[PDB]
Amino acid sequence: SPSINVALKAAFPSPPYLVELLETAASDNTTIYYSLLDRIAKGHFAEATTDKALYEKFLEVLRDDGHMDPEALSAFKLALSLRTATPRVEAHYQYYTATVEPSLSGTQEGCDQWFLIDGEQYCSPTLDTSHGKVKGEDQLRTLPFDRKFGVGCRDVILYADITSKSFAPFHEVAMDLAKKGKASYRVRYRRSPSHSRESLSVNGYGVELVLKRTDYIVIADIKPLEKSELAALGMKAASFVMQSEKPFEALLKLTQDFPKYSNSLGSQNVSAEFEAEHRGNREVFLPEGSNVLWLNGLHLIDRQIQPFGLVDLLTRERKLIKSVLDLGLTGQQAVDLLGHAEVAHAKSGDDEPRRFDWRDDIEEGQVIIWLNNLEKDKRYKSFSPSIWVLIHHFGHGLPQIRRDVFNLVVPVDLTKADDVKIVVEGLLSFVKRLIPVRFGFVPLTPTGQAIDQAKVVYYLLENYGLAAATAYLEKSYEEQSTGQPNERIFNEVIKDKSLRPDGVELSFKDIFISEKHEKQIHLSKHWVERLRAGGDVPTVFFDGFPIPREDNWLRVMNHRLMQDLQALQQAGYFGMLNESMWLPGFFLEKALSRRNTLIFPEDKNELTVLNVNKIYIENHDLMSKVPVIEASKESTRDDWAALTVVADLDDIEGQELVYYALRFRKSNDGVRLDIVHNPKDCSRSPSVLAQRLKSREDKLLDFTRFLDLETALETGEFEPDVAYDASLANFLASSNMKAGDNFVILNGRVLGPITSADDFKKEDFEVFLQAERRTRILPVYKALEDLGLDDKVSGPLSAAKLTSVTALSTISDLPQGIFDNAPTVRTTLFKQWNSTYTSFEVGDASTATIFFVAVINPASEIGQRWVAVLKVLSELEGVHLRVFLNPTVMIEELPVKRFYRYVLSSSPSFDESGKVKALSARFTGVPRETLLVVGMDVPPAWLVTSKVAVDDLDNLRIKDIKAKRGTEHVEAIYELEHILIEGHSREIPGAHAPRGVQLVLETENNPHFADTIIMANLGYFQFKANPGVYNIRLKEGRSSEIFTLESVGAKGWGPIPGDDNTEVVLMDFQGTTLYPRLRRKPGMEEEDVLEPHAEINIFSVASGHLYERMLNIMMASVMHHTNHTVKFWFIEQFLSPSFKDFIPHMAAEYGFKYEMVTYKWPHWLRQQKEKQREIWGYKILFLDVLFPLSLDKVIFVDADQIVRTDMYDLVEHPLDGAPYGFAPMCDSRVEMEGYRFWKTGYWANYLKGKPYHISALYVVDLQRFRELAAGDRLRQQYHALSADPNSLANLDQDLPNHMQFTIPIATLPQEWLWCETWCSDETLKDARTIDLCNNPMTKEPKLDRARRQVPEWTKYDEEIAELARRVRE
Ligand SMILES: *[C@@H]1O[C@H](CO)[C@@H](O[C@@H]2O[C@H](CO)[C@@H](O[C@@H]3O[C@H](CO[C@H]4O[C@H](CO)[C@@H](O)[C@H](O)[C@@H]4O[C@H]4O[C@H](CO)[C@@H](O)[C@H](O)[C@@H]4O[C@H]4O[C@H](CO)[C@@H](O)[C@H](O)[C@@H]4O)[C@@H](O)[C@H](O[C@H]4O[C@H](CO)[C@@H](O)[C@H](O)[C@@H]4O[C@H]4O[C@H](CO)[C@@H](O)[C@H](O)[C@@H]4O)[C@@H]3O)[C@H](O)[C@H]2NC(C)=O)[C@H](O)[C@H]1NC(C)=O
Ligand SMILES: *[C@@H]1O[C@H](CO)[C@@H](O[C@@H]2O[C@H](CO)[C@@H](O[C@@H]3O[C@H](CO)[C@@H](O)[C@H](O)[C@@H]3O)[C@H](O)[C@H]2NC(C)=O)[C@H](O)[C@H]1NC(C)=O
Ligand SMILES: *[C@@H]1O[C@H](CO)[C@@H](O[C@@H]2O[C@H](CO)[C@@H](O[C@@H]3O[C@H](CO)[C@@H](O)[C@H](O)[C@@H]3O)[C@H](O)[C@H]2NC(C)=O)[C@H](O)[C@H]1NC(C)=O
Ligand SMILES: *[C@@H]1O[C@H](CO)[C@@H](O)[C@H](O)[C@H]1NC(C)=O
Ligand SMILES: *[C@@H]1O[C@H](CO)[C@@H](O)[C@H](O)[C@H]1NC(C)=O
Ligand SMILES: [Tb+3]
Ligand SMILES: [Tb+3]
Ligand SMILES: [Tb+3]
């Protein structure tokens, strides 16, 4: 049969199989890593010579040593097929090659392996002699691919080539050294010269064969087009499978070659429509023809449905479920609990407000400057100071009283006129009106002028009084109308208002009081900071209730004022209140001193939870020797909770925090407490202080005073349990905790690091339990009981396992608001659906840990990929899958227009010689007469281009290849040239996308690997790179002038501890996803966009052998026509390898330079299913980011074009401050008018007076383009317009024309373009360049126009033709 074979290979050589197997096996469990490292250092894996034998040996070992069970072994095989660990090993090599070798000066001979201790290299295990002092930049920085074994003050690193036997003795020297406790052990890799430099063959991608002619509709030669009765295709296709009775295989066989089976459907009483019944299924949940996947309730987006994305999900999910099923729950019961209604409700219901302590007490009464006092003002003197005034009657206005009950504190900036106006007009009227509210205001101090004016007003209050200070403010607003202190205005106030300033005497003239400037201003700053009452939008506090200063905040205030009054009334009727009481303190009962703090973060996503069962399984050695206070024997399930405190007992804050936890435990009988001592200094063993407390464990919480706890720590003589020390440092590494840092863990949730123990007091534990209890514990308890699993909770630790697992289930791997429509809410509404005639299951439900629910539409192209991947994941043991087929009756056009193959295996395949088999996409029995297009359906982080192919992948036909090459078999090889580093930026603290910011990617070898600019949409940016250690620096210039980037969010959205870094490392086939943070430098509202290679640069794109042949002619015409230097730029992925291999020969002959450029289409940006449309988008959407920043300007020339001009003239053409220049449509042809569609309603109404331009030739002043941020506007307008499919006929032409109102377009002389179709023959004498624009009444081909229209076209073609033969010979 005539076949097509496609294979993909990586841009880095294949690492040794041995090292790949220990990396795949030990994902991040270090115990399995070093336990296997021992085995190979024995010389145990030396007797296995072939990859198959080596692989075979690992299976026996893992099973025998208890590392893996059937479920985990099956998962290991699939991940090993995927070759997931290969980029992780290459990271070591790139790091070693670029940072180790240039920092290790000297002559290396015999130093294959060497430890690095105190910046000294030792080539021998005996450690007697040191070769050198390794350069400055410290290699002791712990980075992503590192592993640590044991605890030790000294840090030792071994760079080894594991392959040879020379490794074994070196390892044992440091393994034992770590076992003793002298130093902590870690292994780094060295590129092994025993292995060959063969490239790596990859899998986990898909190949598509797209039909490029779909117009026809009314073994295989061509698909037979049938009369347009498309409507039943999905419905009949679904039945075919149900009938088969081997349904999974049928769907795969049908869905892969679907276009070929279209006419074969609808035959022999085909419908069998019993499943018209299952549209009762449609009537309750999903619309017809929609593809939806669930993994234990989790709704997955399309990006997560690849082999890599799915393997990582199972890994995380199993850890979660296994933890649950150790309490006697079936996998089925466990999943049902995770996706329960009460659980999802809690995530939705975690948005409630509270009150905060607005008082002066902390700042010793020197920050709030009140305009009122209702108890002593001689305005309210007439009114009654009675409680019953509030409680009784009241109309609709406000009840008058002489008492302190309602307060309002508003922070005001004295530099800003609008802010000052609020106090003078707003606040004062309320005073005069005798409103029963006390009005206060605190100045904001963000600038120098503001600081001074706070001093001025504060001083004026202190000696002279409120009215005098008031007077300065009033006068300043009307009289001077600016913030800055005015003495011309100030002195007038003192002139009259300076009468008898009582109390402490006046000082006058200049203020720099050590107390007044320092204490008052810094105390004010302490109040604003404490309650986060400043920034872009300040915060007003009414009765401790935050109301941001926006819109009509007084309307919001009045609503709470009435609601607080009704709250006082009800307490009065119950007799709670008395005449001797401070009424404002009724609200302050549950108020917190600090607003935000790690417990109630304003960023709702900021949260970290750990698997509790995991904590007591991995660290059993540690957690069975920690001081434990069991929760009371006679307490209720609702009262139950588990708390663990991590603290540095060698610091006051560390031991203070534990005293508060012990205090809290005395009060709450239901809590079960654990104490973990985490010290900063490793000189003394951590086990001693833990042993001191476990002896006093019985006597715990009998500490009348704090000293009793302090003394207990110091007394006693103990023997260091070094086994305890080892499990302790493993716990911190697993939990991402630094040494000497304080943390608090209630039911898995971590808060910290605690810098000061005053932040977390006994009262803070009580609210932490109260809120945590509500959100996580109560929804678990209800849901659990609803299922009848409430027998399985046997204690506080037993309960924490369940609540901690369900909290981890609702934390997304992908932060909300950046990818697509799929939140972190596990649904269960598909369980209601009837399943008899649309569903089929694979795997045992009783034993399965993983439950997949796929809802696939057979007529969809997306379904083709889904089926192929799901079949391979179904082959895994312990996985259950259930499939639902839902087709649509709405089919206006052909449903599937392509053939599909997925390259993926569930277990590795081996050679006749035992080597690992490479994987390929082989299509057999391909129709001989159909024209096809080859496409790669590659994971989102991948950048792929064709490397080996002699055929036109854009125009494939077997009949032509047979008649030209003699073979019916086509083979093509692609290269995974780059892997993406992509991220989503944000400004700090007022989080906005910093657009126009420039970035530079670097390595220790070269400081300029790559460069890109930040986009407006999601602060998006990307880099093309391979495995290794990189760094991101802001480009020198305006970017570094305005900003400083605190972090690149390499761990997650965060901020997570340990991420205050600018280092990026890629060690995965999923690339690197980043969430960087940038904070503006001192007092800036600046913008980059506004100011405070070769002589000629031409770029183009071609999508066929003909268009590439025409592109060769275009470049040659330029060269013959200019006495200048030219550089050509190409869109890399749309070109053939035949063209790619030819250009150096064109460059040598014609004397030009060339560079390949590309950018991957963003995930947020709207895709193009039609390749020709993709190409058009590449010319207009990514102009600012496709070319390096160093390029001033570029010119686009179409492939079909020919140029007779010296192209420099276009560069020198004045653009009059416009970012890009285009040439207009020809008017010169007299009788062509009918086909001039840009004089019709839509185009003439829109283009009022502006021209209709041509995208065949144009100039882009790139520096101005980026400066104007034109690209962002093009992209968002495209995305918005693209919702309607008939929006842009030719987007390349239509987008600049639709944006010429918004973005200026410089218009070019029409000498710059000629086209026979629209320009007269007389015009061509003065023509500079010629486009071969379409017919449009005829079908004459481009080859015909070229020879007839231009006589020198053949001369150029002959030159290329003989050179191609000259190269071939
Ligand atoms: C990451 O990588 C690792 C790589 O190895 C993966 O593999 C796992 O490794 C760990 C070690 O790192 C293995 O851990 C085993 O833990 C057992 C714990 O079981 C005890 O505790 C439970 C608590 O619920 C209890 O139910 C059990 O009965 C059992 O016992 C306790 O019971 C009481 C309650 O705790 C307690 O009062 C009692 O004193 C007793 O504790 C004793 O044993 C403790 C063992 O650590 C010891 O610390 C105590 O001081 C006390 O002596 C543990 O029992 C296992 O030890 C085995 O190890 C040898 C192999 O069997 C054997 O020589 C030992 O004698 C001991 O045998 C005991 O268990 C068997 C039954 O299994 C029994 O027949 C014997 O009579 C003995 O009681 C291990 O230390 C773990 O097993 C590895 N596999 C798995 C599948 O987890 C790890 O999985 C990777 N991570 C992930 C996420 O995959
Ligand atoms: C007026 O009303 C209050 C109601 O709030 C009456 O109760 C007493 O109020 C005081 C506070 O003003 C309470 O003191 C507090 O006690 C707790 C412990 O319960 C302690 O933690 C606090 O630090 C503070 O000391 C007091 O307990 C409370 N009850 C009694 C019996 O005094 C108050 O009695 C009323 N006034 C009169 C004179 O009746
Ligand atoms: C690229 O550069 C070359 C060199 O400057 C340009 O060549 C030009 O071609 C004309 C052909 O008639 C030259 O004229 C001849 O000069 C010789 C000098 O010995 C003389 O003997 C002949 O009788 C005749 O006059 C001319 O010198 C030369 N330079 C210029 C400036 O015209 C070539 O045209 C350039 N290409 C393009 C497209 O501009
Ligand atoms: C369809 O198949 C055969 C065709 O002859 C017929 O005997 C049978 O009754 C039909 N069944 C249905 C359900 O239409
Ligand atoms: C499922 O089928 C039964 C058949 O009796 C029907 O009563 C029920 O309403 C159906 N439910 C759905 C959701 O289709
Ligand atoms: Tb002491
Ligand atoms: Tb303290
Ligand atoms: Tb053209």
Author numbering: 28 to 245, 279 to 1152, 1197 to 1473
Study text:
The enzyme selectively reglucosylates a misfolded glycoprotein on one of its N-glycans and promotes its association with the ER lectins calnexin and calreticulin, thus mediating its ER retention. The full-length Chaetomium thermophilum UGGT (CtUGGT) crystal structures revealed four DsbA-like domains (TRXL1–4) arranged in a long arc, terminating in two β sandwiches (βS1 and βS2) tightly clasping the glucosyltransferase family 24 (GT24) domain (Roversi et al., 2017).
To probe the functional role of the “clamping” motion uncovered in the present analysis, we engineered four double-cysteine CtUGGT mutants, CtUGGTG178C/A786C, CtUGGTG177C/A786C, CtUGGTG179C/T742C, and CtUGGTS180C/T742C, all designed to form disulfide bridges across the TRXL1 and TRXL3 domains, clamping shut the cleft between them. The presence of the engineered disulfide bridges in the remaining three mutants was confirmed by mass spectrometry. The crystal structures of CtUGGTG177C/A786C and CtUGGTS180C/T742C were determined to about 4.6-Å resolution. Both crystal structures show the TRXL3 domain tethered to the TRXL1 domain by the extra disulfide bridge. We tested the in vitro activity of the three “clamped-shut” double Cys mutants (in addition to the activity of the wild type and the already published CtUGGTD611C/G1050C) on urea-misfolded bovine thyroglobulin. As to the UGGT clamping motion, we tested two a priori rather similar double-cysteine mutants, CtUGGTS180C/T742C and CtUGGTG177C/A786C, both designed to clamp the TRXL1-TRXL3 domains shut. Surprisingly, the two mutants differ in their ability to reglucosylate urea-misfolded bovine thyroglobulin, with the former mutant more active than (and the latter mutant having similar activity to) wild-type CtUGGT.
